[PDB]
Design an enzyme around this catalytic site. Structure first.
Site, PDB file in Angstrom:
ATOM      1  N   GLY A  10      26.158  -9.851  -7.318  1.00  0.00           N
ATOM      2  CA  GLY A  10      25.110 -10.642  -6.704  1.00  0.00           C
ATOM      3  C   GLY A  10      23.738 -10.026  -6.710  1.00  0.00           C
ATOM      4  CB  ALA A  11      22.435  -6.647  -6.900  1.00  0.00           C
ATOM      5  CE  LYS A  12      17.714 -12.814  -8.950  1.00  0.00           C
ATOM      6  NZ  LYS A  12      16.399 -13.335  -8.409  1.00  0.00           N
ATOM      7  CG  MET A  13      20.388  -3.591 -13.822  1.00  0.00           C
ATOM      8  SD  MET A  13      22.042  -3.117 -14.378  1.00  0.00           S
ATOM      9  CE  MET A  13      21.723  -1.480 -15.005  1.00  0.00           C
ATOM     10  CG  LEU A  16      12.384  -1.379 -20.223  1.00  0.00           C
ATOM     11  CD1 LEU A  16      13.138  -0.862 -21.432  1.00  0.00           C
ATOM     12  CD2 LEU A  16      11.010  -1.843 -20.691  1.00  0.00           C
ATOM     13  CG  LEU A  18      12.356   6.836 -17.915  1.00  0.00           C
ATOM     14  CD1 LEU A  18      11.551   6.686 -19.182  1.00  0.00           C
ATOM     15  CD2 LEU A  18      11.566   7.588 -16.847  1.00  0.00           C
ATOM     16  N   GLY A  19      15.453   6.181 -19.479  1.00  0.00           N
ATOM     17  CA  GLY A  19      16.477   7.196 -19.645  1.00  0.00           C
ATOM     18  C   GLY A  19      15.958   8.592 -19.304  1.00  0.00           C
ATOM     19  CG  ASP A  44      20.940   5.778 -17.220  1.00  0.00           C
ATOM     20  OD1 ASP A  44      21.807   5.067 -16.697  1.00  0.00           O
ATOM     21  OD2 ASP A  44      21.202   6.809 -17.944  1.00  0.00           O
ATOM     22  CE1 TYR A  49      23.254  12.374 -19.153  1.00  0.00           C
ATOM     23  CE2 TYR A  49      21.597  10.990 -18.083  1.00  0.00           C
ATOM     24  CZ  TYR A  49      22.720  11.118 -18.914  1.00  0.00           C
ATOM     25  OH  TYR A  49      23.268   9.974 -19.452  1.00  0.00           O
ATOM     26  CE  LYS A  78      24.693   7.005 -17.274  1.00  0.00           C
ATOM     27  NZ  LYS A  78      23.515   7.912 -17.236  1.00  0.00           N
TER      28      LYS A  78
END
Ligand SMILES: NC(=O)C1=CN([C@@H]2O[C@H](COP(=O)(O)OP(=O)(O)OC[C@H]3O[C@@H](n4cnc5c(N)ncnc54)[C@H](OP(=O)(O)O)[C@@H]3O)[C@@H](O)[C@H]2O)C=CC1
Ligand SMILES: O=C(O)COc1cc(F)ccc1C(=S)NCc1ccc(Br)cc1F
Ligand SMILES: [Cl-]
Length: 316
Positions: A10-13, A16, A18-19, A44, A49, A78
């Protein structure tokens, strides 16, 4: 194009983002600050990382500055492979939250389907160089992810680098409580992923395309590898539209109903890569770009290839 895609929670993503893989810790704070200033609303991230603290400094400053409100940001991280253990998932999520200066994530992904032995090393190896697996499977890890939703730590959960049959296993899990919202996979004109994308989209999962520029800064790049950004066939499409090759490479997944997460630490490029909402690739352009598929992957890793859950032996 509209800027966000509706997820199955139900959420909006934002389509585009940024990695941040390979973004140096001494550069990524400024990169994320610039990105937010020029319109990015999706970052992201990942614990592996090693730069989430520095990403978080930027997020927190822009929230403090009231450049943005928290509800307007969409922050993704992640769960690393060494934390596929019922008793380690919450703490891994909480470390990421602490580093990013957040009290929730918008989306938390199982980074790879493979669990590895817990410990300090991100890639624990045996004396012959094989990764040391965990016995913990993708379904029990998924249940642990579901608990994070039910504790308010994350708004959505998803998967990354899951093949068709692994997505299916998730969807067929006995007692499944929350479907994955997203499968984040490598996708670009040389690895077009038609089969896995159609499967995921048919199940209502949103696909995020990683390495959309072909990851020219990947540490294992060889001179003879193909290069999207230098491919004159793609450069010609860009020239026709009076855009850069990178802008074509970013717009391409957008028109496939994908989310896309190009990485840059170069302020000019961060801005360039956002200027992808005022042109359209034709259907012929799209089919032409799809025709460049060669099943070429940036992200693969020999040391993990015997793991029972290593994803890329299946066709898709
Ligand atoms: N889930 C997973 O397993 C994975 C997730 N990802 C995610 O996807 C993100 C993107 O993929 P990534 O592999 O980093 O590679 P990308 O395909 O995004 O390529 C990044 C490289 O392209 C350069 N670049 C960026 N914009 C431009 C431009 N406009 N013109 C020319 N060169 C440009 C960058 O240089 P510079 O920075 O110097 O400007 C950098 O060297 C990652 O950072 C990570 O967030 C990636 C791999 C795996
Ligand atoms: O993974 C990232 O997001 C980007 O890449 C990485 C980012 C890191 F910070 C550390 C290692 C990787 C590697 S080497 N990733 C590839 C990889 C890892 C695990 C398995 Br299972 C297969 C595989 F192909
Ligand atoms: Cl991670």
């Amino acid at each position: 194009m509209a800027s966000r895609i509706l997820l199955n929670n139900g959420a909006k993503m934002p389509i585009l983002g940024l990695g941040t893989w390979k973004s140096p810790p001494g550069q990524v704070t400024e990169a994320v600050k610039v990105a937010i200033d020029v319109g990015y609303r999706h970052i992201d991230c990942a614990h592996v990382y090693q730069n989430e603290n520095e990403v978080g400094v930027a997020i927190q400053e822009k929230l403090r500055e009231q450049v943005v409100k928290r509800e307007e940001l969409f922050i993704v991280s992640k769960l690393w492979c060494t934390y596929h253990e019922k008793g380690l998932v919450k703490g891994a999520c909480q470390k990421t939250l602490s580093d990013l200066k957040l009290d929730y994530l918008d989306l938390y992904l199982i980074h790879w389907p493979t669990g590895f032995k817990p410990g300090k090393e991100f890639f624990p190896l045996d004396e012959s160089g094989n990764v040391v697996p965990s016995d913990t499977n993708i379904l029990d890890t998924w249940a642990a992810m579901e608990e994070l939703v039910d504790e308010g730590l994350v708004k959505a959960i998803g998967i990354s680098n899951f093949n068709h049959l692994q997505v299916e296993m998730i969807l067929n899990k006995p007692g499944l409580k929350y479907k994955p919202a997203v499968n984040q996979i490598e996708c670009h004109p040389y690895l077009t992923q038609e089969k896995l994308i159609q499967y995921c989209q048919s199940k209502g999962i949103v696909v995020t395309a990683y390495s959309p520029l072909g990851s020219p800064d990947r540490p294992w790049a060889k001179p003879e590898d193909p290069s999207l950004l230098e491919d004159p066939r793609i450069k010609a499409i860009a020239a026709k539209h009076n855009k850069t090759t990178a802008q074509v490479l970013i717009r391409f997944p957008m028109q496939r109903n994908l989310v896309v997460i190009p990485k840059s630490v170069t302020p000019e490029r961060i801005a360039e890569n956002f200027k992808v909402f005022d042109f359209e690739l034709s259907s012929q352009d799209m089919t032409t770009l799809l025709s460049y598929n060669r099943n070429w992957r940036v992200c693969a890793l020999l040391s993990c290839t015997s793991h029972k859950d290593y994803p890329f032996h299946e066709e898709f």
